[PDB]
Design an enzyme around this catalytic site. Structure first.
Site, PDB file in Angstrom:
ATOM      1  N   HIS A   8       0.845  -1.161   0.000  1.00 44.75           N
ATOM      2  CA  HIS A   8       0.000   0.000   0.000  1.00 44.75           C
ATOM      3  C   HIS A   8       0.888   1.222   0.000  1.00 44.75           C
ATOM      4  O   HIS A   8       2.124   1.151   0.293  1.00 44.75           O
ATOM      5  CB  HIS A   8      -1.023   0.038   1.171  1.00 44.75           C
ATOM      6  CG  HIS A   8      -0.473   0.510   2.494  1.00 44.75           C
ATOM      7  ND1 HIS A   8      -1.243   1.209   3.394  1.00 44.75           N
ATOM      8  CD2 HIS A   8       0.704   0.272   3.120  1.00 44.75           C
ATOM      9  CE1 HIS A   8      -0.542   1.457   4.492  1.00 44.75           C
ATOM     10  NE2 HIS A   8       0.643   0.883   4.361  1.00 44.75           N
TER      11      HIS A   8
ATOM     12  N   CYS B 107       3.400   5.720   5.290  1.00 45.82           N
ATOM     13  CA  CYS B 107       3.507   4.610   6.213  1.00 45.82           C
ATOM     14  C   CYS B 107       4.979   4.159   6.134  1.00 45.82           C
ATOM     15  O   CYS B 107       5.602   4.251   5.051  1.00 45.82           O
ATOM     16  CB  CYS B 107       2.541   3.520   5.778  1.00 45.82           C
ATOM     17  SG  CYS B 107       2.821   2.017   6.726  1.00 45.82           S
TER      18      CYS B 107
ATOM     19  N   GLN C 105      -7.728  -2.322  10.065  1.00 45.07           N
ATOM     20  CA  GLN C 105      -8.972  -1.578   9.941  1.00 45.07           C
ATOM     21  C   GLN C 105      -9.847  -2.198   8.809  1.00 45.07           C
ATOM     22  O   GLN C 105      -9.337  -2.582   7.745  1.00 45.07           O
ATOM     23  CB  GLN C 105      -8.702  -0.099   9.653  1.00 45.07           C
ATOM     24  CG  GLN C 105      -8.039   0.684  10.844  1.00 45.07           C
ATOM     25  CD  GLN C 105      -8.031   2.233  10.657  1.00 45.07           C
ATOM     26  OE1 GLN C 105      -9.043   2.845  10.231  1.00 45.07           O
ATOM     27  NE2 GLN C 105      -6.902   2.865  11.008  1.00 45.07           N
TER      28      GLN C 105
ATOM     29  N   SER D 259      -6.420   6.516   9.186  1.00 48.44           N
ATOM     30  CA  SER D 259      -5.008   6.808   9.036  1.00 48.44           C
ATOM     31  C   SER D 259      -4.842   7.714   7.847  1.00 48.44           C
ATOM     32  O   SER D 259      -3.898   8.520   7.814  1.00 48.44           O
ATOM     33  CB  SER D 259      -4.186   5.539   8.813  1.00 48.44           C
ATOM     34  OG  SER D 259      -4.509   4.578   9.812  1.00 48.44           O
TER      35      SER D 259
ATOM     36  N   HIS E 213      -5.489   5.386   1.278  1.00 53.16           N
ATOM     37  CA  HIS E 213      -4.624   4.274   0.820  1.00 53.16           C
ATOM     38  C   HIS E 213      -4.851   3.947  -0.707  1.00 53.16           C
ATOM     39  O   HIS E 213      -6.013   4.008  -1.195  1.00 53.16           O
ATOM     40  CB  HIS E 213      -5.006   2.972   1.545  1.00 53.16           C
ATOM     41  CG  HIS E 213      -4.871   3.037   3.036  1.00 53.16           C
ATOM     42  ND1 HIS E 213      -3.801   2.496   3.707  1.00 53.16           N
ATOM     43  CD2 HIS E 213      -5.669   3.583   3.985  1.00 53.16           C
ATOM     44  CE1 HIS E 213      -3.940   2.691   5.008  1.00 53.16           C
ATOM     45  NE2 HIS E 213      -5.061   3.356   5.204  1.00 53.16           N
TER      46      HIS E 213
END
Ligand SMILES: COc1ccccc1-c1ccc(C(=O)O)o1
EC number: 5.2.1.8
Length: 145
Positions: free
Chosen positions: A41, A95, A113, A136, A139
């Site tokens: 990701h 990330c 998640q 977050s 993505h």
């Protein structure tokens, strides 16, 4: 049609296409549940991110709308072949899995998640998602296995 896929009409061409409401993928061709999948990701965070901080930038101040923009540019470049996923993820992902080309290894349901999980389990091996929103951030997911 496999889980999440639906027919739509192109509002530019009036040509039919397919979109997936779980992964946010969209494509012209007609499309085509494992215990475990493997995904990479590319995360883009914004100021309403759970944690507004990453290895790239101590204070993330970009807006949710600006984040979606960056995501859409990266999706365009990936789909045009102008950059590959691993390379944009390494440079650009908020990330720290950026350091492994975005790779997260294999996981099963129960671990991530939900919006991320559902997208990753609805992808076909090889297949990339559209923008996927979680607390977050935004993505792009690639299912590698
Ligand atoms: C693979 O990482 C995630 C998958 C689902 C939902 C959130 C994450 C994630 C990775 C890193 C962060 C964060 O900094 O909040 O959040």
């Amino acid at each position: 049609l496999p889980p999440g896929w639906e027919k739509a009409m192109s509002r530019s061409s009036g040509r039919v296409y397919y979109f997936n409401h779980i992964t946010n993928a969209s494509q012209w061709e007609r499309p085509s549940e494992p215990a475990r999948v493997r995904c990479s990701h590319l995360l883009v965070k914004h100021s309403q991110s759970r944690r507004p901080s990453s290895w790239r930038q101590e204070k993330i101040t970009r807006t949710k709308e600006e984040a979606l923009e960056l995501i859409n540019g990266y999706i365009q470049k990936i789909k045009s072949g102008e950059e590959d996923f691993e390379s944009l993820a390494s440079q650009f992902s908020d990330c720290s899995s950026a350091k492994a080309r975005g790779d997260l290894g294999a996981f099963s349901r129960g671990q991530m998640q939900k919006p991320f999980e559902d997208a990753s389990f609805a992808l076909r091996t090889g297949e990339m998602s559209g923008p996927v929103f979680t607390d977050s951030g935004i993505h792009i997911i690639l299912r590698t296995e």
